[PDB]
Symmetry: C5
Subunit: 95 residues, 5 copies
Amino acid sequence: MQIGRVRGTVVSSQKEPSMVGVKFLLLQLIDEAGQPLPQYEVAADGVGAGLDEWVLFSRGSAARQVAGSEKRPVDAVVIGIIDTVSVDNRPLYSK
Amino acid sequence: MQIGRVRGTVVSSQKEPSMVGVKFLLLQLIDEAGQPLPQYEVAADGVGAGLDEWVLFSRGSAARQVAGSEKRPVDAVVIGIIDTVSVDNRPLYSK
Amino acid sequence: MQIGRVRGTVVSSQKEPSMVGVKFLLLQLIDEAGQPLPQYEVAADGVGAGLDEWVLFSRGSAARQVAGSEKRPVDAVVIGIIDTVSVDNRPLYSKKD
Amino acid sequence: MQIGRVRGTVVSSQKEPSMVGVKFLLLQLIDEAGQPLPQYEVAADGVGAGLDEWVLFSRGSAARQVAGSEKRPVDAVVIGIIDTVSVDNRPLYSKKD
Amino acid sequence: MQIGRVRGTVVSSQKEPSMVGVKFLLLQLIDEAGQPLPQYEVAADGVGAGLDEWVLFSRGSAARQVAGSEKRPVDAVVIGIIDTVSVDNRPLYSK
C-alpha cells in the first residue's frame, strides 16, 4: 500500500458499464517524510475520503476485493482514511 | 488508474488468436498538473475513445474483467472517457 | 520479494470493514547493498515485526494468501523478519549483530 | 501493454518442468518516440517473432491466459507482432519500411 | 521475466508458517551482458541455483504457479537457470 493525499475527483459519463456508480478520487502520493511527490493515482473510493485527507490505497487485483468490485476493471482502491503515521516512535502525521 | 491522452493506434495482424477483435489505443500519460508525460501505455479499448480524448485506464488483471476479455492476455484497458478532472474544487480539465 | 526496514506504523479507524484487525507497518526499502532507499511501502503484518527490524515483504495478490486475507484489499504483506542476508558467502546483515 | 523490439533469445535447460516448450525472447523496450530504451523484458513467445520485429507484450497474469500457460510461472507474454503504429493519424512505425 | 545474478541468500526464522521450506535467493538484476542494474529481487528457488549463476525469474502471481506454492505469499520465483543468451544470432552469454 501507499499513502496518498486526496486532491480531487475525476468524472466520466461514457465508460464501461461495470464502473457505473463508482467514485474516482485523484490522489497525490506522499513520501516517507510526509511531503508531496509528483506521482498520482486515480482510485475507487468506497470509504468516503474528503479533500486533503490522507488515505491508504492499494493497487492491482486488491482493488477488486471490496464488496461489489470483484469483476470491475479497477486497479486502485482507497482502503482507509489515515488517522496517524508514526516514524521512529514519533508522530509524522496526526489527523 | 491513471489518466491518458489518446495519441494513436497500434495494428497487429500476426498475434495470439485470443487477441482477435481488440482495438489497441496508444495512450500518452498525463501528469498531476494535466501535462503530457514521455510515458505511454497501449490499452484495449471497448469504450470508443478518439484522438486527443482523455481516458481513465487500468493496468494488470483489471483488463480481463470487462465482458469478453476474461481469458485474453491483456494487461491494460480503457475504462472511461474523462469529462472533467477537478482539483481542490477547480477545473483542471473539462471536455 | 523485497527487503524493507520497519520505520513505523499507520493507523486508520475509518476504513473498509474487511481490513479490521490488520496492522499496518511503514517499511523503508533497503537495496541490495543493505542501504536505505527514498522509497517506502505500507504492508500488512501478522508476524509481529518491530521497529528497525529488516523484513521480507511481497507485493500484489501474494498479500491475500495468508489465512484471513483472502478477500482483503491488501497489496503488500510482511512474510518474515530477516535474521541474515549474505552476499558472496559473506555477511551483509545479521540481526544478531 | 508496452512495445518491445526483439533482440534475441534466452535458453534454459535446467528449469521448472512447467516451462518446457516455452520460447523465451529478449525484448528491448521502445519509448514514446519509437526509440530503444535501456530497459528489457524476457517474454514467452507463442506468436513467433523474429529479430528486430516490434511486438506488443503484456505483463503479469495476462501471460497465463494463452492456451497451455494457465499454470505456468510466466509473467510476460508476446501477444502480437506490430504492423503499424500511428500518432496523430500519421505513421510512427511501419513494418514494411 | 528478467535476468538475475544469484548474489546471496536471505534467512528468516520468524515468518508466516506457509513460507517455511522456501529458499530465498538474493538476485541482482543484470542485463544480457551481465552488467548490474540498480534493482534486486529476493526470489523463491525450487530449481537449485548457485552463487553467480544467471537465472530467469518471474514476478507476481506467477510465483504461486509452482506446485506447493499455490497459497504462499510469494511474489518472485526462479523459473530456470540460464545456459545461453543469444543476441543478433551471436552468443553473448554462455555457461
